[PDB]
Amino acid sequence: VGTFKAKDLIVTPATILKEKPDPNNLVFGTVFTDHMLTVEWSSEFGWEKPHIKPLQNLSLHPGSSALHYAVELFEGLKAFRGVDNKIRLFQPNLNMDRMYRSAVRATLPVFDKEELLECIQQLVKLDQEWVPYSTSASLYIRPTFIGTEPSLGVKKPTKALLFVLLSPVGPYFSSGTFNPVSLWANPKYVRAWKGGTGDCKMGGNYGSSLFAQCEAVDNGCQQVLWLYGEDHQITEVGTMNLFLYWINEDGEEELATPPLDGIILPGVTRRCILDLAHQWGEFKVSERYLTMDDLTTALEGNRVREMFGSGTACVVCPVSDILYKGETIHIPTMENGPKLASRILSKLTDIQYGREERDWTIVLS
Amino acid sequence: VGTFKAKDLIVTPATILKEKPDPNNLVFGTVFTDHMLTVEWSSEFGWEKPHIKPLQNLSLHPGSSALHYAVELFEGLKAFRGVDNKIRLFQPNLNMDRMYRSAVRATLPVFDKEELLECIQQLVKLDQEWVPYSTSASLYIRPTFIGTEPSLGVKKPTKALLFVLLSPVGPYFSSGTFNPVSLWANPKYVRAWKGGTGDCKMGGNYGSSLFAQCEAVDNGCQQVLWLYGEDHQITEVGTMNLFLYWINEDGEEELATPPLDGIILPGVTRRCILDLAHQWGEFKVSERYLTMDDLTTALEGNRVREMFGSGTACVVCPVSDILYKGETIHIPTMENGPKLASRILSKLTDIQYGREERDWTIVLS
Numbered sequence: 001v002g003t004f005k006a007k008d009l010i011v012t013p014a015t016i017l018k019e020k021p022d023p024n025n026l027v028f029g030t031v032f033t034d035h036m037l038t039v040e041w042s043s044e045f046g047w048e049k050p051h052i053k054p055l056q057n058l059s060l061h062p063g064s065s066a067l068h069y070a071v072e073l074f075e076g077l078k079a080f081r082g083v084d085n086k087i088r089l090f091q092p093n094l095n096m097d098r099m100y101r102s103a104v105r106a107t108l109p110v111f112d113k114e115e116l117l118e119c120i121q122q123l124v125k126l127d128q129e130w131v132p133y134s135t136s137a138s139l140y141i142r143p144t145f146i147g148t149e150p151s152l153g154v155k156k157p158t159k160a161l162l163f164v165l166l167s168p169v170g171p172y173f174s175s176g177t178f179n180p181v182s183l184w185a186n187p188k189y190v191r192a193w194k195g196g197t198g199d200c201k202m203g204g205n206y207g208s209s210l211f212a213q214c215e216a217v218d219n220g221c222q223q224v225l226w227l228y229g230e231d232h233q234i235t236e237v238g239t240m241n242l243f244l245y246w247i248n249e250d251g252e253e254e255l256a257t258p259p260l261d262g263i264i265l266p267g268v269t270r271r272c273i274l275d276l277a278h279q280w281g282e283f284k285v286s287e288r289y290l291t292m293d294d295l296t297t298a299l300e301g302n303r304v305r306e307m308f309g310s311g312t313a314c315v316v317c318p319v320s321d322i323l324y325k326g327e328t329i330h331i332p333t334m335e336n337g338p339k340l341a342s343r344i345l346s347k348l349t350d351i352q353y354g355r356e357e358r359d360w361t362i363v364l365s
Numbered sequence: 366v367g368t369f370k371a372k373d374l375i376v377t378p379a380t381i382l383k384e385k386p387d388p389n390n391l392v393f394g395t396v397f398t399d400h401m402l403t404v405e406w407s408s409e410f411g412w413e414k415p416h417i418k419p420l421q422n423l424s425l426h427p428g429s430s431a432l433h434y435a436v437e438l439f440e441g442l443k444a445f446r447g448v449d450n451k452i453r454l455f456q457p458n459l460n461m462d463r464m465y466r467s468a469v470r471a472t473l474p475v476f477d478k479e480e481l482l483e484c485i486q487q488l489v490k491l492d493q494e495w496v497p498y499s500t501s502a503s504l505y506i507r508p509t510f511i512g513t514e515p516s517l518g519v520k521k522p523t524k525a526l527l528f529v530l531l532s533p534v535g536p537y538f539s540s541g542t543f544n545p546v547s548l549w550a551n552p553k554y555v556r557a558w559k560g561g562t563g564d565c566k567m568g569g570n571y572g573s574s575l576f577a578q579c580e581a582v583d584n585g586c587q588q589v590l591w592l593y594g595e596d597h598q599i600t601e602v603g604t605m606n607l608f609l610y611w612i613n614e615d616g617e618e619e620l621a622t623p624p625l626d627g628i629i630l631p632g633v634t635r636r637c638i639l640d641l642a643h644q645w646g647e648f649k650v651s652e653r654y655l656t657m658d659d660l661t662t663a664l665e666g667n668r669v670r671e672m673f674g675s676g677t678a679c680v681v682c683p684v685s686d687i688l689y690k691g692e693t694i695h696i697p698t699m700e701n702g703p704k705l706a707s708r709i710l711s712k713l714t715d716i717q718y719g720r721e722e723r724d725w726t727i728v729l730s
């Protein structure tokens with residue numbers, strides 16, 4: 001055991017710098033900054049000194065376990081250029097907690113979370129001009145941890161690479177205003193199972209998801225509604241946690257989300273939304289199981305107000321439509337404002353871009 | 366939608382050749398040959414011309430979907446230097462069928478199966494001296510298909526690499542004659558689920574498996590017994606299909622294996638063993654569900670003869686012991702010969718090394 005340390009950072013500035021993109025015409029994860037973080041690991045010598053250096057291709061042995069046995073995990077967090085032109089990270093300690101936990105579950109070697117965060121701060125600081133000059137755009141931070149074991153043996157890797165990429169991203173839909181998603185619901189496909197890795201951000205979870213995603217796009221849907229179990233539990237909306245704002249069976253007004261029972265990725269946005277709803281104390285907040293039957297029963301009873309997905313990329317993604325067993329189930333999210341969705345988006349946006357102070361934000365070192 | 370063609374092969378021989386290893390001191394997937402196959406793909410231009418060239422590191426964009434979203438699959442088949450010094454592939458068309466099917470499920474681009482097989486034949490032919498001069502050793506062939514999409518966008522990859530590695534491998538256990546495995550049975554972990562990709566050889570299935578494998582090694586076990594469902598179905602023995610030779614509940618002598626209901630990798634060895642057992646017609650052959658309760662009930666009734674795993678790496682791996690609910694359940698496989706296990710290994714070995722003729726073997730082009 002041990003860790004790489006930020007104070008040992010070897011910075012190799014780029015001699016040639018790239019023109020930044022137009023913040024208004026940005027496709028997600030397409031454009032990359034001048035520099036990246038890389039840290040080598042071996043079982044023999046442990047963590048090498050971390051490097052900030054020019055963005056380059058990785059030279060990987062073709063037997064690298066990341067390519068064969070998906071010995072890999074990632075994270076998604078953002079840096080935001082605020083209204084006061086100060087750059088802020090948003091709850092980055094929750095990403096470090098989740099990446100550590102993912103590393104343990106992948107059997108990739110542990111590291112000091114404070115040392116990674118500080119290494120990421122230095123990377124964003126070097127490339128701080130890539131944090132878009134726009135109140136509707138952000139720098140996407142992609143920490144990645146891959147096994148580079150050069151053997152086809154299925155085992156704990158004896159070699160690993162931890163690297164970070166920065167990618168400037170614009171608003172979720174390039175129109176800026178709310179574009180509601182249609183969800184493809186086919187229970188033939190299952191994202192995660194009890195005793196699986198669904199509650200970790202491990203690459204394996206996404207490779208298996210990709211067929212259903214393409215099947216969704218074919219039928220005019222943007223995301224997959226992930227169903228689980230005999231009773232068709234609604235779990236996640238694609239790459240996002242699932243929120244339902246409704247009148248519940250007891251007749252109380254309720255914000256409901258599936259509980260962290262192993263098949264749900266504990267999202268940062270999900271945490272923040274639950275924290276806000278609790279704090280406001282205006283309606284019942286329930287981590288509880290939701291079925292398609294629960295949802296359709298409520299729809300014919302006009303009890304559904306809003307449904308939305310939460311995640312680092314979209315923050316709040318309203319749901320208008322679900323395609324399930326060949327019928328098109330409409331969700332009246334956009335006909336109800338969407339009131340709660342708009343309030344959450346505005347609250348999180350205000351915090352991220354420094355319009356109000358919060359413990360959730362850290363100004364860049 | 367098209368394909369690369371064997372007749373377009375661009376061969377770049379190596380100017381410096383490596384010394385072959387001692388077949389008696391070979392760890393699995395550790396040592397690699399002089400050359401590899403590489404074929405580039407793009408959505409724009411389609412399949413580039415295939416290349417046989419010196420074994421080298423892959424230069425990959427750090428955003429490659431194989432590293433982030435485990436957009437990857439592999440295969441495992443062998444070349445065998447026979448008793449007549451002719452090199453044979455073993456049912457390689459089943460590997461091509463299974464790799465194609467896996468490519469469709471991963472949303473990686475399709476290819477002509479005959480053209481891949483012929484490209485692999487040419488690769489093995491160039492490196493044919495790496496096929497060990499040993500009747501107990503083989504050349505492991507690792508076709509690999511990875512998404513090289515340089516964007517963090519979760520979608521069908523617009524760029525891919527299909528590459529093949531050759532690795533000389535020794536006998537299954539390095540002490541030659543049968544060394545039985547002890548299995549770690551902990552139902553907390555689940556390899557595959559209904560609606561998953563367990564019946565495909567996609568990297569994601571193995572990344573998730575790795576924690577249970579390390580937990581097994583900790584408790585002196587070599588493989589994991591993968592349990593599924595309320596009733597604890599025995600599904601696979603680690604990276605191998607599960608065979609049970611026993612007296613069944615009706616008192617008939619039976620060779621039983623879990624059925625291809627979505628959570629079982631349809632193994633080539635599994636297919637061949639079922640085909641042989643059917644052909645012999647000496648006992649009942651049942652693709653049917655096996656539970657830990659079924660197994661323990663049969664053990665206390667002295668109805669269990671042999672249990673073994675099947676797969677390209679081991680062929681037949683006898684099981685002596687299962688660690689389950691803290692106790693050590695002994696399996697009398699080694700006290701019963703193992704009769705059937707030894708007969709299967711000898712039949713498959715005879716076919717692979719050309720001691721008897723079979724439709725299952727192809728002599729190298």
Ligand SMILES: COc1cc(OC)c(-n2c(=O)cc(C(F)(F)F)[nH]c2=O)cc1Cl
Pocket residue numbers: 152153154393441537538587588603604605676677678679
């Ligand atoms: C040292 O004991 C072993 C343990 C193994 O897994 C735990 C394997 N093994 C396979 O059986 C199959 C594959 C795969 F997936 F490539 F087919 N890869 C492997 O490492 C081989 C040996 Cl010799």
Ligand SMILES: COc1cc(OC)c(-n2c(=O)cc(C(F)(F)F)[nH]c2=O)cc1Cl
Pocket residue numbers: 028076172173222238239240311313314517518519520
């Ligand atoms: C509107 O089109 C999109 C569709 C998406 O999922 C298909 C995503 N998307 C990612 O691509 C990656 C992640 C992550 F980071 F979790 F992997 N989360 C996301 O929502 C982003 C956009 Cl902009």
Ligand SMILES: *Cc1c(COP(=O)(O)O)cnc(C)c1O
Pocket residue numbers: 076201236238239240241265266267268269270310311312313
């Ligand atoms: C990343 C992710 C989320 C949302 O996590 P955030 O930290 O809010 O971005 C939800 N579901 C899955 C499957 C995810 O991978």
Ligand SMILES: *Cc1c(COP(=O)(O)O)cnc(C)c1O
Pocket residue numbers: 441566601603604605606630631632633634635675676677678
């Ligand atoms: C590869 C594999 C097998 C065996 O397949 P073969 O073609 O016989 O090598 C069995 N189970 C799993 C999970 C596998 O990945």
